[PDB]
């Protein structure tokens, strides 16, 4: 009750004010733990009340920070898990087959235990996601290869550190200005023994002619295979497409969102202009419009491969993955 | 560490907002459809303050009613807000003397006015202050917060400009003065007698009006009954360096924002900065106050649109525009760099530039308003042109076929309003 | 002479020889105006020629007429540079104009002779609308005893493609008429595209009937060579950045129905002019050589 | 003689053929005071070259020509020798010293070629004072024609391509672009400008200030966000440091990035460049010929720590600070020169008509 | 010829080597060939004869009047000056790499450059953030217990670092037009006390720039004999390298 309410309020305020969990996996774990706490603590008779309350909590969580899709992704995953559990315990996708062939009020005592067990299994699968993704590094990196990365991605870092145990290759890291987080990635990879280069975004095209493949992370994967990545990733994808350089996205399955690129102006995250133009400029700040978008939209035609904890896939298959994770009625939430 | 407290002064004892502040207190003035005290409370809550005492004297009834209806008075708010009211308050020194008398603060509280807009985290400043208190045996008493700025910025009003002389290696304040109408700044040589090195004269500091104080600050305020303002305390403490040193230090931030809305120029500058997202995450679309009437959506060129706006055909919102819920805009209009409150009605073929419209304002067709300000439920008739730097207060109605002068302030109250008016400008 | 008889001369000379192009008729009219001027100053001659070109371009809104007018103005300026005295300059300009008229008359046969070699036996040729130079090219090809098929588009605003099909059937060449929306459907059947031009812009692109750009884009998408036949007097120092950048005096009066569009040089394989077979990059050079 | 400047730090293997220097290190510590081997004007010019006191292409060319005018004024021919050969041979060590301070730009290379051709053309029978006066006058005339009149002509040409209500995107700092926009605004065109900047030089801020002082509405952003703002952009106006014989545009790094992203958004790309910056050399990529700036400039203070501080302690870590990039001619729609509006493929043609 | 060396003496060889030798030695190792010396004549105008036995590359000496000031002595040798002047004093005993000062005069096209050292009537020196440009200079005699700064200076430079105890090395790089101004206005008597503060004042009213390099290795032993031992105490340390 009070503990649950204060935990929810703290989570919402942390999302609204930023900071909190740097790791996306940590954010997913905290979201799942909070959802489990709501399921255990909150009182509900039938599954319909659970749907309504989880939907309200997820709506509040995503309204706190719409650019943080992992929270909504986990909320929809929990809703799908609850729906599947109810269908298994009570009963026995839209398609041409279903179209040709063709009630949550009922109550069950053991449904809650099954829901918690499924959520715990999901958490266990989430725990080993990074190792599962990194275990595929040797199948995609050959000897004396050149890899291009932008910003700081922990999944890509684990990928490269696992590949470096048996192969020698070069990694080029482009800083993601203004938050030049690529410097930390470069120094980490150098500490791991990999030979690394640090450069600004302005050189992304210039050196792309000498890059064998591009390995990047993302914040979100849309239903059509599009990316909500850090800013400057669209230019990197365009430069890779110019040279037909394969672009690999190493992203866990919990970053898949059933949304579509129809949404406008809430996609990119806009922050204080101080990052781009300092406050000490003076009077010219009065008449100059300064905008600092954090995220970028990447169309699916610029992506070659998705590597996740379940293996490799093409963007054209992303829809099927989206069909296996979320019910079509939970996209609106 | 003990819980972090904060003393909030909801009374501006100066009267730089007359005659606007006659009806509504300055602490409740809407900057971007949100009152200044809301921004101050949000800033205090975000920085880790757990206890916040508010002191209000002038029109304390409305302030208390607004506070009890706000988010921070909910039982779920981590920052507890207490309201202390007394009609005998005349200055900040009186408030601090009352604080000392009632022993409200135990150690290391935050002193700030009720009209500050900031996103500053004082955790590093608090750590430095506490470390120097522990090392130097509580000799230090106060650390001021300053923002690295430029003298040419709009937020650097001439009245509030301050030049400081500090010790570089330890961030100790040695001299402090204002630059109101002075082309020459003088510094006593005694500071150089204190140290042969480290003395630096800084003019690139914008006074955020945030301080980290100690109970000894309240004790000194009680000892010296002549201390009315914070400047009085700073000057009296710095001039008497020979006896009872009680050093004052400073902290400078370069990536965060901090400002105080002390006049109309400051109001315009801070409103522009907030609309342009300089106080992120405190943005109009963030809706940091959980109220349904202030929700909106953000769009390219900094366009903020609330629920049920229904913008007319042919009208253009160029950039930096905020629209409240229920506001109706006519056709073939031109709004730019303006904030419009909820429930406003705007005619057709009207050009608003750098104006600020509060809730209830109705504007007739064909008007031209530039760099003006309209208060609650103000009215404007047809064929009216407002020159820059014009103010209409509290349901003032301006008649048709008149061009107002530049610095024309109009209010229902006769004396303070430069042109008393009811339904026109010609008598 | 006078505006009324200037327009009358233009229209009558176009009428009496339906074969001669509009630009050739405009240049002939301007040369006749030069012949009977009764002036004594090269400044007044330049002003009067500019006014006559303005009137002629007001009579019809074709790019070729304006191109010919600019070429005539450059010719007058060059002749003035050569000879300072106006009395000596006038006769030289008259004879040079006569030679220029003969050359621009022979231009069509030169283009046909140079272009007929690029079409093979059994090739499928796609054209866009009526073009006299394309007709001459096909006549030269059939005179060379070559067998080929031709597709034309109806060119909806004025069914000049039907006129081209009739003129080709008059010589008994197998031709087909397809809709303006069938070009993308018919591109895979064809082997190369031959179109005319109403004017060649500075960067090597062309201005031509409203259907040319889509045909060029489809040919590029299906990797088909795109050939343009155009005379040299249709070279204009215009640089359209896009379709909207085309001057409006050439779109309309010649819901919204522009008469011409612009094709970028990257969509053009070769240009066949009286100067020879050129890459699109050559045209700019030509213009840069003409204006010092 | 003049000692060889030491390369600073470890370079990327792909760029190991290029020199990489340190801004703090200067050649003047090992050189004599007063300057004897190198002319004092050349020493001062190299000092402000290596410290970055003058940076622009036209600014660098003008400063070089002013220092060369000082050298010609201070020059005296030796007995039994001719100015035409002695001056040419004497200028080479100064040019080598200047290149050691910082690699020469294309505009400076063309200026050196012009000055060497003009000095060679000086007859032996010509009097020394007359020859020096004619050399100084030729330098002044070169500056006039190739900079001022060229910029005015390019402004007049670009006025026809700027309409009311269009959005123009510019990158970094270019005096020609700023002049074009300022005169376009003055003549009566109404528009807005989008300014794109990149680390670590942040030269675009310069242009921003200019626009603010001219009354032109302006927007500011960094290069990674460029793809966000190109949907609302109508034309892209880019300055050039050099135009190559194959039509490629050698410019500040990130220019080809902007050209590619603008082509992805169906935005025409216009390049303005004076014909004296046209080069006969060809270049297909940014690796074979480029400049390596000081790597320590990449260090930035984020939060309270500098991640790239003491980056040389890591053996496998390298810092790359590219200066220039090359834009292929297929990404450029139009070049504006004092001769007019031309395609990129016409760049060699100009090189043919300017030479003879 | 960007610099002409001028040594000021209006000295007694109090040390291991003659006091004049060390500034001359520094000027020789930095690259100077021709050096102009002004010899005292109040006691005896025979310092030229004494220095005629030296082994320096090239020396040019001029006897002075009975009593003259440093600005007056610069006025004495005006026909001998054709370019920017490097003014030194015979008491300078230091091992500065001269490029640390001359470069300040080179890169920024400075009107005047000077060298000062950290200390072991005090002089108040105010510099900018970079620590190179000199913005303010004062001595306690002129000011009545109040250090005064113009508002425009703080508008252009909003951060001024103040040094209270620093030692001036009296080593100056000066432009020609400074000496020309000294000609047009003969009121100034000493460069170190009036001329340089006047130029600092004129920096904020064609533009005037003044730069100073602050050093923390060694400095000149003061004219008073109290520090005259210290130079010797350091001389053996510097004799090995020099």
Numbering used by the authors:
A (entry chain D): 8 to 99, 106 to 115, 121 to 351
B (entry chain I): 40 to 466
C (entry chain A): 1 to 254, 268 to 305
D (entry chain G): 166 to 521
E (entry chain E): 1 to 10, 27 to 136, 154 to 238, 259 to 295
Can you list sentences taken from the study reporting this PDB entry?
Here we determined the cryo-electron microscopy (cryo-EM) structure of the eIF2B•SFSV NSs complex, which revealed that SFSV NSs sterically blocks eIF2(αP) binding to eIF2B. We successfully purified the SFSV NSs protein and determined the complex structure of human eIF2B and SFSV NSs by cryo-EM at 2.3 Å resolution. Two SFSV NSs molecules bind one eIF2B molecule and are located between the α- and δ-subunits of eIF2B. We were able to assign the amino (N)-terminal ~200 residues out of the 261 residues of SFSV NSs in the cryo-EM map. The N-terminal region of SFSV NSs contains a β-sheet, followed by a helical core. The interaction of SFSV NSs with eIF2B is mediated by the N-terminal β-sheet region. The β-sheets and protruding loops form a concave interface that embraces helix α3 in the N-terminal domain of the eIF2Bα subunit. These residues form two clusters (clusters 1 [c1] and 2 [c2]) and bury spaces between the helices of the eIF2Bα subunit.
After the recognition, eIF2 is released from the ribosomes as the guanosine disphosphate (GDP)-bound form and regenerated by its specific guanine nucleotide exchange factor, eIF2B, a heterodecameric complex of two copies each of the α-, β-, γ-, δ-, and ε-subunits. Various stressors such as viral infection lead to the suppression of cap-dependent translation and the activation of the integrated stress response (ISR), since the stress-induced phosphorylated eukaryotic translation initiation factor 2 [eIF2(αP)] tightly binds to eIF2B to prevent it from exchanging guanine nucleotide molecules on its substrate, unphosphorylated eIF2. Sandfly fever Sicilian virus (SFSV) evades this cap-dependent translation suppression through the interaction between its nonstructural protein NSs and host eIF2B. Here, our cryo-electron microscopy (cryo-EM) analysis reveals that SFSV NSs binds to the α-subunit of eIF2B in a competitive manner with eIF2(αP).
